[model samples]
Target: KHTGYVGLKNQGATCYMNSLLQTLFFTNQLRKAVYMMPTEGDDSSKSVPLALQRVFYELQHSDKPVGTKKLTKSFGWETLDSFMQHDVQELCRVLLDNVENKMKGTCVEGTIPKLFRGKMVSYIQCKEVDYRSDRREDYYDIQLSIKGKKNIFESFVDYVAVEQLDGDNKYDAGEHGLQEAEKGVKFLTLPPVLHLQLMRFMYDPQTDQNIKINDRFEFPEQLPLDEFLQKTDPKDPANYILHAVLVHSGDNHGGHYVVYLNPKGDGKWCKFDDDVVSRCTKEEAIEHNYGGHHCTNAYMLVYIRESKLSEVLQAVTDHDIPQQLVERLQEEKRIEAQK
Candidate 1:
């Protein structure tokens, strides 16, 4: 029964937060970087970075599931606030952005981008006017379409797939007004760790509401994204190995969130379901989560680039957990004891 791993306690609807935190914690470099965040003069209860550092500390050092009350409180959420469906993707973004800002002057500066940032180049080409404009942007994750796509590559194809602006949809090119243009986006680079969010819950204008799409969407363990990547570097690899499968079960009303994680990036995976961490086969972990019934479906995916797997899974020593942070936790407990 001992998977040598821990889970998290869900407070009302904290499953999303827990599942997301579980995924991030299992992401080795991210965990290490979070620990390396500077928490010198911050209060754990009010400070997001300090609270996260402590949370990661407890998760790594304990065998039992950890509580997320204090961590959530650090987000300035009230009791009622924590009970609401605070979207996992949004919560993850806020946490990462805060951590990114916190790591400004630390040794782990730019750690967030180093792990999650991918470059995107959007271009609008007009052959008639011989005009092509490109703008570079960075993305931490990508939301993939699932309605018409059966697999990940299909979504990628549809993503970079171009659209022509002509006739009624003519591109108003400033000087060359009302001209035809081919518009689309392409990836210039992919990060070491990539986060893919499935467009499961979408707006249905026909239904006049938002509905959950439980269609069968397949994703492979080895994502050979080489074809989708730009020819910026021949030496760089776009292929990646699956690290975690985050699942959500239920309808548009509500749902339960759980994370199937391959913590070691090894074959063995575990399901962390809010205080219950169970050893699961790849079938139950990855296969079962493929969208099918009105039940559990893969909502978000975490992948580690094949070429950078070692870096993603690199070891972090206890020495890396600085004495300052350790003392900070002890003092936190001391303050609690005084209360």
Candidate 2:
């Protein structure tokens, strides 16, 4: 099984005791999906407004759905609501109009495949395979490796258990999450544990030297702006992705991975540091990048035909989710929020 890689490594075998994991084992496949940031720049607050404008204009003619509530929740709805609560129609109209009116739009760099042909700026997509929320956090154990005609790079995740952490217990490096393997088992929560454990391997210590590696970027006690980027720098698009995951996960399993086809910079997607990268807890072999996003971002909340679940789980354990389940989860979750 995998070890300390994603938030799940910290989950330990306690997750093994989780009824969700046990049920999934009886089922088979986990489902899969993705969650991309609305903006590539670090300034999500500023970038979202601009990006939404671009998205609305791009989809101005088409029939793709676009509303402020739906869009806000899609962006994890934590920050925008903290400041304002206007009508969805008004928010959509004003935000889109203002963003479109702006002269310089956010730039798209790197070799990222254009997954969306539509003008709307949606970076996240959840699959609809066949898994459940109880075992959703179990996916943090595997690593995703992307391969091209001649190049390759790996992405790792630790499904940080989030449901359990009270407001007082925050996420800390090596100390925050529930040690399912070490302690018995517990639901997901953002304990003040290893913030470093999350990025220790994935982020480049040298390049990310500016930000404190171990501290939570979203929870800035004083200057919320420092912890939050107004717009994501195209040069450092991935930083926003990580920020989204860490910040959103603190709320629920609504978080996921957005595997970009081509990361910018040298274009040589960085490799996992053999020495520092945390180990995974599951045993799924690092396979080649599937399509769109890779890894187990979509491995959670799968809901396939009962038969398929049984079959996939027999072959694989935690990381066996299909893409179909993610779509359903996103739709269902969105619907619930509207209600």
Candidate 3:
């Protein structure tokens, strides 16, 4: 049992970045990989990977809620002004990509991609004709639509659909042989670290404003994705365990972001809200994240591929953790157990 983890102080309205950074730090595999990156001759001021390593070091060794002003400023986010809100998902994507870019041509060139990338197949077929086409594509993350859905899987199943297109209209004067039919998208392969973004915000043309969808959609700590997989053998892993959840706490116009992180596969969960970190129950993590009556809802989820969790965790911890950090974690665990 670990009582507390390091929290991040919000620099102005940088909660989005702080929350996302917490999620990334909780991802032991990613943290380990970044820690193992070569910092020699690398400029930490301009390197996202180095900045992340330094941040993780501070989180693991320091006793206080860490300040991210240097990291944010180093990443050029200071240019966004101090008070503007940004999307956490977008920030996550940017951070991952930038980190990978910094690792290019290095020994760990493919580490991030190998951990975060997944594959999906897009299939289109004409109901009235024999026209059909399909292709496999790689996705860094999956976005689940929250429209009229009770759960994440339901929205995932409804993600691909038949839609009307100009070239597919049969009655049109210049219509091609194409006709409208079902467009199916299914998972070909899932990555070790799968990121799922819940589409909770949308722009309403009628109101001419972006709005948050406060639908009550349920999610499990252990997510079963076999039902949504396609062209995969039974032996392939089809499950993912939730490790981190990025939560939004307000409407689209203005809001704050926080994260729920489970460190080292421990049952204990913590809410990382800017500079405040507190122990939270699993029930609170699952139930409170279902938006509707509460503004706090899961916006993005980070899941570790089920079959690889043990192996990945072992590799990460056995190789990358510093001796000082290990001692600190053990001390914290001992303190927690005594309480």
Per-model TM-score, in order, reads 0.94, 0.17, 0.84
Query: How far does residue 181 in candidate 1 sit from its true spot (Å)?
Result: 1.2
Which runs in model 3 stand beyond 4 Å of their true positions?
1-4, 79-85, 127-129, 164-178, 315-339
- Candidate 2 residue-wise lDDT, 1-339, digit = tens: 122221111121111112121121122111111112123332423444433432332222223222233334334434623322322223323432333333233332210112101111111111221212222232112222221111111122112112332246422224323222211123222111001112211323367532211221111111111112223334322221111111111111122222111111111222112112232211111122211222222111111222122333233322322234334434544775796
RMSD in angstroms, all models?
1.9, 23.4, 6.2
199: Cα error in model 3, Å: 1.0
Prediction-by-prediction clash tally? 0, 81, 0
Model 1 per-residue lDDT tens digits across residues 1-339: 479877787776665678888888877788888877778888768889988888788788867677777888888665665635455678888899989998998888988999999999999999599788899988999989888788888999999999898889988888877789999999989999999989888776598977778888999888988788777566776889999998989877678888998888887899988889989999888878887744779879999998898888887777768888989887776886786
Q: Against the true structure, whose lDDT is highest?
A: 1
Q: What is the overall TM-score of model 1 with all chains considered together?
A: 0.94
Order of models, best lDDT first:
1, 3, 2
